[PDB]
Symmetry: D2
Subunit: 293 residues, 4 copies
Amino acid sequence: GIQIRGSVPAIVTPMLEDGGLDLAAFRKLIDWHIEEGTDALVVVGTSGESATLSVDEHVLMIETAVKHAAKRIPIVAGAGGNSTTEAIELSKHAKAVGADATLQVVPYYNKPTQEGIYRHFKAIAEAVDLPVILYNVPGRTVADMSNETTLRLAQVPGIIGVKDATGNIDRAAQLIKAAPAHFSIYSGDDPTAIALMLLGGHGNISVTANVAPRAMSELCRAALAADVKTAREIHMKLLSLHKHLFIEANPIPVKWALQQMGKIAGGIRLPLTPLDERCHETVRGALREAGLL
Amino acid sequence: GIQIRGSVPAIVTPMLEDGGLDLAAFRKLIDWHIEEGTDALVVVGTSGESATLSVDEHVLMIETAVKHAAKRIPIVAGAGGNSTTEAIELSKHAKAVGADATLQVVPYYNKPTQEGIYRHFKAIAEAVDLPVILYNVPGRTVADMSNETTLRLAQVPGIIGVKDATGNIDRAAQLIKAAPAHFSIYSGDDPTAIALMLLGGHGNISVTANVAPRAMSELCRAALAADVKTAREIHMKLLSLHKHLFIEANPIPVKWALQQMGKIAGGIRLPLTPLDERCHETVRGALREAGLL
Amino acid sequence: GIQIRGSVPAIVTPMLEDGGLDLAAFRKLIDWHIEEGTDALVVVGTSGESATLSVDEHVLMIETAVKHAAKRIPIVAGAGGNSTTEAIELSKHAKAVGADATLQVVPYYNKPTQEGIYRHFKAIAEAVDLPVILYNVPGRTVADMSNETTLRLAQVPGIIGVKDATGNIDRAAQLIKAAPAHFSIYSGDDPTAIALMLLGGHGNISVTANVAPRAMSELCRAALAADVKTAREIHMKLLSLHKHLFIEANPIPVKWALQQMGKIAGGIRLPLTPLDERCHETVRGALREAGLL
Amino acid sequence: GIQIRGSVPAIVTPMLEDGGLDLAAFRKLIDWHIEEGTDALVVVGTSGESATLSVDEHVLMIETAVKHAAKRIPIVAGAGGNSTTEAIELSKHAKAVGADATLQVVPYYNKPTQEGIYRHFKAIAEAVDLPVILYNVPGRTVADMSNETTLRLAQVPGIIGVKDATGNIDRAAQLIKAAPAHFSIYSGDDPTAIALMLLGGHGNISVTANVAPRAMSELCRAALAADVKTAREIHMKLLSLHKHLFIEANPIPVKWALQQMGKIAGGIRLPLTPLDERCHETVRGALREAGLL
């Protein structure tokens, strides 16, 4: 089976100033992540602006990552949505261009019931023979997949884990305790990921690791090895980054950060906007403090 | 310009057992609405399951509604989303098959800034020469278009109003007081719509009106004529319906209700699900009490 | 029984510079309220800083208000809290100095169950032969008395109504529709009170009426007579005041406002503080705009 | 200086069936805690029903604990409230009967500003020469003492720590990182306390430790020694207890639990109520699973 563990950046989608895809920058970013110690990548998730890419651009981003990664690390493709048929079709594309798994968000906006969430994910897992990592982020979807629903889906073949973005460490302990052995609990909340991992979770699917891949890889490695002192020392150093990369909605700040670091151009697609001028010095100070600028 | 005022059901999308469209039932529903006093329809809005229709199905629903209405009432097409370029394409399609305006939801899931929301809607109004009604529903989108942003967009040519689903009656009065003369304020919250209209708003884009179009047309007529006593007597009779049509996420309950009334079949598309059996007694009781069953 | 209807300011407790009571200013305020059309007063409620008065000061304020009013208007004494035995003692004291009713807040901080809330208020009504008006303000208490619990208490002898500060206009209509004939529904939310009264409620226990008692008495009079047009014209004029009197926690802004109007001195008791200097311009602007300054 | 560290039960106030104080049971409970490994006790805090005790009963509870503890462990007296003068007077009593410190809640109900919260605590610390531990529990107080305000008060002589009941592990890391060396961060949230301590905090002021003092003492000892494996194994065993002791508002379930364990009688004071019958089997199963029944 595919083994996804440790630091997994939700990597941005680099764009030219006019919003077109910047595949040259994307390839360089992938090589940089691999040499810095990144364990896997989630491609065209929320941080990758999946909302504003066409189907052709979405699949091209996955294929580009798969081809360039060249099996050095696993590539997980964001492929979910609030339509079960659309998520099935995107998952078929991700499989066809060689993704190792899909990341599947709980439906946003249309507020399905718990049973609707179960049937949605179960239909996706059954329709496409490729592993599924669930993604619960009620702060964006409104609908909230309960632990009970999550653990029902852990019994469905193909569903290998969940990205929990709640930052609710009680809920994470409940999932870790009750989860079957094959089922991985990943943080989706950089400020609390260290705790989720110290309690027995399996990794962090991360915004901060976009700009600090080596530090985040070391933090995950230590937290998963039950080494509190090493993990918390790194975490405390990144604390201002964990905060200020959300000064506006992710990925607005992290894309401006990577532009300041010289790794991408400024493109970002409406309705997202370039980081507000008023926020620049705050993010700049966090990057300079982290030694990134 | 087009006059949209009064009771405006957000009409369901009738489907057959596999979710396929049921245009014959839809045309009959439109005729019933016109006979019962409905003032305009919003087609393939949230209540119409826009999230799970293909672009072609979306356009076919609008075209069917425009043709069948035969200019007897205005047809407002839901055509928004969280991608600015996609909303522009859908708005083009809506204009091309004869919609009188589009209903444009604030982007869900990707959490744009206020300036992102402003730029998103302005781009949509400028790209397609057809009126726009904005739609703020933070209970589904998370992003919340502030009154300040709304009133800025009221200065943009083509933006003729807003559907305010917050149920926040302070916010409604603030919009009513400050809105320019050309800019209509509609309720998107059936339980509070009577108050929004009595304070000077212009109509109610409604779930309850799917099943009680005559009563809701009379409620809006009275509230807009400052006739409290008539409006509140109708409102109180419908009070349980306003509640139990949301016992599960709209449009799950109202589609079940219209099926019990013999007006549509049971189709509904995942991730939405047929109304939970545990809710049937309660919803039918509200229908029967309101003289609809 | 006593008739409490219309505009009922939750009157501030005037204090001198060290927080000591200022009964001379208080008596002058009561006379001004009566001249301006105020219908009744709630004395040493939340707006009266009940939290920081001694029992003796609490009782002296009630006694002063009863004596000075001289039966021209009813005096409702705040006498509740989160201890059932303490609320009984305060209610005894209020009856003994001639209050016409007590205002009884849902227990704050200790988060009783619905049955705890029921038993608390029932014990208070039974212990002291004086009418009780319940007071639900979950924005301050956290505990929220459900409509079901409220309507159960409406069956208890002596419990004559409820002050509903939620601003939830659906909840208000539900209470109005189900309330027995003897049981009054009052607003506790100045921004939405007009809607609660137009739907059939009975009055507004008000912060804004501290500074605009004549306008608020006319607003309530019109709303209770189903005169939308008159009520809403007054409401819109006061809309900014309804907002900026809460720019900091009530009663911080309204005490500063009454001082600017020359009606009280600046005393206010810790942990409350004089209105922040950064808010002065905004609050005075609302006062001046409303013709109060 | 007094050194408060590790497992600190917020001990219940045992009552006879009629609600009178049960000092004999209280003394036995104190001896049981000391032999089971409890490090300190908070007496007549929220869990001790401070809301419904008289001043005489409040001070008698502190004195009883101080006398019986006989300096074997530190005794911290709850002594705060939403009136600065009342908190000063209660703190004087706590000092006079030999408490080692007071625990001071942020004002509930009257919603002070951040500056009002600062001045409240600063006035308490200055008025009574005894250490102060701050207590932030916005889930009960509504007012929320920001980290910035907390760290300002860390500079005031006498203020030696804060009990943070938010369960917000991001906020706890921020406080731990920025706190002066003399200033202790205690959890007030049993489900997350392990994480707060592993990140560098200093103890857990606990509900669960009322029924599992030895386990909680071992968990705190291990978490403070950076021993993740030992701490998390204990934590996972107590997970159902951490949850179900809040099935109704603390201290309703923990007092019923201790009655089932034979350590106290059933008394509890309105508006709190004995644990709902419907909850008994759930709490009983959690206690039997923890080996306590």
